Design a protein around this ligand. Sequence first.
Ligand SMILES: [Mg+2]
Ligand SMILES: [Mg+2]
Ligand SMILES: [Mg+2]
Length: 257
Amino acid sequence: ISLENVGCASQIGKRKENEDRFDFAQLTDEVLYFAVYDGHGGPAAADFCHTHMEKCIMDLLPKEKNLETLLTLAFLEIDKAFSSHARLSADATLLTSGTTATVALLRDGIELVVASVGDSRAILCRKGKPMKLTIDHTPERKDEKERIKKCGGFVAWNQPHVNGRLAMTRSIGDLDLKTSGVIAEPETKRIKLHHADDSFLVLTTDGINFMVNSQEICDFVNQCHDPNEAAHAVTEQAIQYGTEDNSTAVVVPFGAW
Ligand SMILES: [Mg+2]
Ligand SMILES: [Mg+2]
Ligand SMILES: [Mg+2]
């Protein structure tokens, strides 16, 4: 698989700042990495993940063969690290910096494992058909809503927000909300790639999901010249449709073995 073909686009929208981060790399001969991090309350947490997620994963690869298990551990460990980092910095705003994290690992060119927390997304496009790889952690979900309430948190409105502050129920960072139920533990999904059909991994932040459903994303991937043109087209449509938030898309082409 060729990382030269990865397409990526990130538009600030109408925000003062762009707090979306994204990355990809080949960790080892057998493992490729792809990630988006949608930061809020300052980029600190999103930046921390961007900077360190690869090390956390690579330190785990030889210890843990189950990649769902590995990503779960990595997420929790990096969250531990950011919490210490935050509590130690002079900048007291880090205490309320946090981020989604959507991380994909592809092993041996066929085994795709995705972990995320928050409302950024991964989908797989194959034959122009989307398959969802993540489910958004929002207060709308009964199970999430119940943990928040059982942990002592609440949900307010003006649209649902954890303790009147956070539009999602899991994240990396958000130190003050951790005991109120906003956990760093990801949900995970594992699939095998198709041997004959090409497929595309697409990572997006909620700026994009607000306005472009995942079928429409597969159409762009299916119709646009290269992944790069597709990534730009997806983000630009989101903005055209009325999105004002940071909008980020990563399009990864997988060849069929
Ligand atoms: Mg990197
Ligand atoms: Mg953000
Ligand atoms: Mg966002």
